């Protein structure tokens, strides 16, 4: 079951760290294929494939962020024989955070780093009536990813197969409620787009309130999907953070 959830596009047997990579609500494991190539051999990428995406399109979407986290903790166990860092974008950032919080009590060594991309701090909310994604937002964000994910849009048969799950997960993201007063103990490095309407700089810096460790905010040029255009400076930052304590 572990490799149905986790895709290893580039084996790196001598890697000093594994990086669990969690996509946004629309995204699939394949989004992270170039990162896997980029980070190996020093870091081994484990790209997460949520139920309902790509090859898992026939599976029902998860019941909640809580449930997804529960299921992912069990899946990550076999991979705990080396240090785990988490990278997540938007929805993925939330799950990354919840994983990080739960890992030690679940019987995994504490994560070595949390990279939170394109997401306001877990304690930060907005009174904006956003309880899910509009169809126009959903499609816009798929197009932005390019690759196999954007390709679905010219494939209405396959799009029909994955839409229910993607919609459900966007609703999960807005139904999400953090546990107040919790902090991870690992370093948190925050990536955010300078003109992302969904994440303000204050909201991004507020991740410092969710760790007892160092918090490093990096604002990069771009919107909600800045990470596509800004992969190089991000990868430079990630490789350095993961090359030391």
Nearer to Cl ion, 140 or 231 (CB): 140
Residue number with CB closer to Cl ion (144 or 205): 144
CA distances to 29, 46, 56 from 36, rounded to whole Å, are: 11, 8, 21
- Tell me whether residue 90 or residue 108 sits nearer to Cl ion (CB atom): 90
Task: Figure out which of the listed residues 43, 91, 220, 238 binds Cl ion, where binding follows CB under 5 A.
Answer: 91
**CA 40/CA 10 separation, integer angstroms:** 7
- Supply the Cα-derived Rg of the chain in whole angstroms: 16
| Candidate segments 84-92, 99-107, 148-156, 198-206, binder of Cl ion by CB under 5 A | 84-92
Shortest separation between residue 36's beta carbon and Cl ion, angstroms: 21
The reply on whether position 89 binds Cl ion by CB under 5 A is no
Nearer to Cl ion by Cβ, of 85 and 145: the residue is 145
Binding positions for Cl ion, 167-206, rule CB under 5 A:
none
Question: Applying CB under 5 A, does 25 fall inside the site for Cl ion?
Answer: yes
> What's the closest the beta carbon of residue 239 comes to Cl ion, in angstroms?
25
Rule CB under 5 A: say whether 24 interacts with Cl ion.
yes
**Cβ 146 to Cl ion, closest distance in Å?**
17
Sole window of 17-25, 160-168, 193-201, 207-215 interacting with Cl ion (rule: CB under 5 A): 17-25
Q: Which has the closest alpha carbon to 234: 223, 219, 224? A: 219
Compute how many residues bind Cl ion; rule: CB under 5 A.
Answer: 4
Q: Which is nearer to Cl ion, 132 or 213 (CB)?
A: 132
Candidate residues 21, 90, 166, 184; the one interacting with Cl ion per rule CB under 5 A: 90
Q: Residue 22: CA atoms inside 13 Å, Cβ hemisphere, count?
A: 32
Would you say 90 or 114 has its CB closer to Cl ion? Answer: 90
Task: Decide if residue 145 touches Cl ion (CB under 5 A).
Answer: no
Beta bridge pairs of residue 46: 20
In this structure, the number of other CB atoms found within 10 A of the CB of residue 146 comes to 12
Residues in contact with Cl ion by the rule CB under 5 A:
24-25, 90-91
């Amino acid at each position: 079951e572990a490799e149905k959830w986790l895709r290893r596009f580039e084996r790196a047997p001598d890697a000093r760290a594994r990086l669990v990579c969690l996509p946004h609500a629309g995204g699939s494991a394949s989004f992270f294929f170039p990162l896997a190539k980029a980070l190996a051999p020093a870091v081994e990428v484990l790209a997460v494939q949520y139920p309902g995406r790509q090859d898992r399109r026939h599976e029902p979407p998860v019941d909640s962020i809580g449930g997804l986290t529960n299921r992912l903790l069990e899946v990550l166990r076999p991979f705990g024989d080396r240090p785990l860092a988490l990278f997540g974008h938007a929805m993925g950032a939330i799950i990354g955070y919840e994983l990080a919080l739960r890992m030690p009590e679940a019987g995994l060594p504490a994560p070595v780093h949390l990279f939170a991309s394109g997401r306001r701090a877990p304690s930060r909310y907005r009174d904006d009536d956003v309880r899910g994604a509009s169809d126009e937002r959903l499609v816009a964000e798929l197009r932005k990813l390019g690759g196999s994910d954007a390709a679905m849009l010219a494939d209405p048969e396959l799009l029909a197969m994955v839409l229910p799950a993607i919609r459900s997960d966007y609703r999960a993201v807005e139904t999400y409620r953090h546990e107040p007063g919790r902090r991870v103990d690992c370093p948190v490095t925050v990536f955010t787009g300078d003109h992302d309407p969904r994440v303000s700089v204050g909201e991004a810096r507020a991740w410092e309130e969710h760790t007892t460790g160092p918090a490093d905010l990096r604002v990069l040029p771009g919107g909600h999907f800045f990470l596509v255009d800004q992969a190089a400076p991000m990868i430079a930052t990630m490789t350095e953070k993961l090359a030391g304590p």
